[PDB]
Amino acid sequence: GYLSQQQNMMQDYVRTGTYQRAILQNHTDFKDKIVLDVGCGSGILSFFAAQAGARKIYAVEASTMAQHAEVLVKSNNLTDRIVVIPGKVEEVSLPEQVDIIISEPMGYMLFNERMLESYLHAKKYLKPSGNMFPTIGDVHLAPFTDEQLYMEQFTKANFWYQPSFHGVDLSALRGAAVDEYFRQPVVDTFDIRILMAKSVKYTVNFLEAKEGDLHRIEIPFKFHMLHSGLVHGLAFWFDVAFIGSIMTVWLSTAPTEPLTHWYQVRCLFQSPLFAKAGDTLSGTCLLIANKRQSYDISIVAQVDQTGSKSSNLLDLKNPFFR
Amino acid sequence: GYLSQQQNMMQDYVRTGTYQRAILQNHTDFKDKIVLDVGCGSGILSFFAAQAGARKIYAVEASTMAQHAEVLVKSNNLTDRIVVIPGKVEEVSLPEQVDIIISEPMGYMLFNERMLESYLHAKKYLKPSGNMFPTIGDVHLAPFTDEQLYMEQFTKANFWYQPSFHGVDLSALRGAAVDEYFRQPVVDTFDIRILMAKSVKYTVNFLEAKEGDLHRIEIPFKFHMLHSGLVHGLAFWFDVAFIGSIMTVWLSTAPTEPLTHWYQVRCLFQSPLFAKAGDTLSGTCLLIANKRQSYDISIVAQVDQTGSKSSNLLDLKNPFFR
Ligand SMILES: [Hg+2]
Ligand SMILES: [Hg+2]
């Protein structure tokens, strides 16, 4: 819980701006309503709800951060509208059902850090027919070609393919190194020209979802290739929508959108799949929740026409940055 | 413990070449001797001991890097000379007392990550009149002038002096922020032109030092000023020596020597001190250990002739890269 971290999140104008934009333009959803702020991370969220004219804002509240919020609430003259309860939703108690829940629970590929579970858990404190900001989450995935990124892996791992690095033969660990390097999802951004087919969408309606739904989360796909080339993996990004009474407002991390701190995520295939235009690449992406507040990512994919296959396991716990 | 981190360590050619130089050039220290590799940092140290002709090399390594070390031992046909023992030194048992202990226990400012405490605890397995590689550690410090780095930090902290960020007053958290930003040391290299006095030296002898004992570490300094102007902070770096039987080999981290993955480190004061050529800048650097794996550092500085004071609490558990 560093202020540096909190600053970095505040600096993301798309994040902070869109959140604020969504709350103020949907004024009638906040005017004299009771709100719960479970997320933050920018720490600025319960203030937006005050600016939209909320009656009471219960704000929990991670052990840092509880104190950071406490100072700003006092200094912004809002002690009588915003209460700061240190801790976490599955650990604390609220004295009142709320109209709206607000939070910033999105990680890399939306689900990383598993904060949405705590978010969905908060619906124990939600009044019937109340809503949540954000309301839904659209995960997008599409196949990509990128020779330079694929090759990059082997140039790295080939360091181990030396028989006499300072008189030591490292070659027996080359295979383990390749596996490891391919096991990391790549966080950075790309030109859309590397996208081989139109993206499929997978939608989580936060208003109806139970927190158990986020433990397995299976995403099937049947891409219809626009371009001829080699598929090196699947690209991932996400959108969330703030569906209010007045207006639905979108926060998008698409590669066609201005850059955010979430960038985009690419999961490579260990064996590239050749596909033609008009060919269908099908398979499923499986995200298993793991013990390190992250996901084990399983990707199986085949080119229907040729029957070539892979067969790929990632751990979002150890992402490669760029 | 990822291959890759290990690969990063290895690719530091100064570090790897110097460790080999130290061992091979002091072969009479290893020839037919019993060695303890406690690092291990990069699995590679045991192999140097093996190249030097050690009779038996026990290598205490963590889990999982114990596996990766074993693979290399078998594939390099050294299974009769290198014995991997999984776990930690303050846990495991050795069938024998050892002639030499070898390790890579250095972090930033030398002491970071408190690996040295494991290193000195290994003296348990050391024969009387045994040796350690490295034998001693020299911490150098020098006052520096760097106008650009100072205001660069201050203007980042300056974010938190803001009466209306999306309608929110952050002003009250300035000072918590400034404290945080100036607590983090700057890991960077620099031109030696910025050095405002010849360095002073603090020696920690590993052969005699008790794990006690590296929990406090009081470093006094008394610089002769050489150049007039503003002292923006203190620069720190470490030399480490392998005092073998044939010759002493130094691994230097100094800004005058080729670059290493350790770079150099700087505490910048929250407020620069003015000093003239001929003046004395005296004071102490305190390194109070903490739970879990880092130091709380108290830098007390004054110009004798004035005497303008500075006291700053710097926290290693960050820091600021570049
Ligand atoms: Hg918050
Ligand atoms: Hg320092």
Swiss-Prot record, chains A, B:
It comes from Mus musculus (Mouse). It is found in: Nucleus; Cytoplasm; Chromosome. One of its GO terms (biological process) is regulation of DNA-templated transcription. Homodimer. Interacts with NR1H4. Interacts with SNRPC. Interacts with the C-terminus of NCOA2/GRIP1, NCO3/ACTR and NCOA1/SRC1. Part of a complex consisting of CARM1, EP300/P300 and NCOA2/GRIP1. Interacts with FLII, TP53, myogenic factor MEF2, EP300/P300, TRIM24, CREBBP and CTNNB1. Interacts with RELA. Identified in a complex containing CARM1, TRIM24 and NCOA2/GRIP1. Interacts with NCOA3/SRC3. Interacts with SKP2. Interacts (via PH domain-like fold) with C9orf72. Interacts with PARP1; promoting PARP1 recruimtent to replication forks. Residues 1-300 form the SAM-dependent MTase PRMT-type domain. The modification Phosphoserine is found at residue 63. Changing residue 63 to C/T: Loss of S-adenosyl-L-methionine binding. Loss of protein methyltransferase activity. Belongs to the class I-like SAM-binding methyltransferase superfamily. Protein arginine N-methyltransferase family. It catalyses: L-arginyl-[protein] + 2 S-adenosyl-L-methionine = N(omega),N(omega)-dimethyl-L-arginyl-[protein] + 2 S-adenosyl-L-homocysteine + 2 H(+). One of its GO terms (cellular component) is cytosol. Methylates (mono- and asymmetric dimethylation) the guanidino nitrogens of arginyl residues in several proteins involved in DNA packaging, transcription regulation, pre-mRNA splicing, and mRNA stability. Recruited to promoters upon gene activation together with histone acetyltransferases from EP300/P300 and p160 families, methylates histone H3 at 'Arg-17' (H3R17me), forming mainly asymmetric dimethylarginine (H3R17me2a), leading to activation of transcription via chromatin remodeling. This is Histone-arginine methyltransferase CARM1. Phosphorylation at Ser-63 is strongly increased during mitosis, and decreases rapidly to a very low, basal level after entry into the G1 phase of the cell cycle. Phosphorylation at Ser-63 interferes with S-adenosyl-L-methionine binding and strongly reduces methyltransferase activity. Phosphorylation at Ser-63 may promote cytosolic location. Methylation enhances transcription coactivator activity. Methylation is required for its role in the regulation of pre-mRNA alternative splicing. GO terms for molecular function: histone H3R17 methyltransferase activity; histone H3R2 methyltransferase activity; histone H3R26 methyltransferase activity; histone methyltransferase activity; protein methyltransferase activity; protein-arginine N-methyltransferase activity; protein-arginine omega-N asymmetric methyltransferase activity; transcription cis-regulatory region binding. Changing residue 63 to E: Loss of S-adenosyl-L-methionine binding. Loss of protein methyltransferase activity. Localized in the cytosol. Disruption phenotype: Neonatal lethality. The lungs of neonates do not inflate and they do not breathe. The same neonate lethality is observed with mutants that produce CARM1 protein without enzyme activity. Embryos are distinctly smaller at 18.5 dpc. They show reduced lipid accumulation in brown adipose tissue and reduced amounts of brown adipose tissue. Thymocyte differentiation is blocked at an early stage. Mutants display complete loss of protein methylation of the CARM1 substrates PABPC1 and EP300/P300. S-adenosyl-L-methionine binds at residues 6, 15, 39, 61, 90, 118.
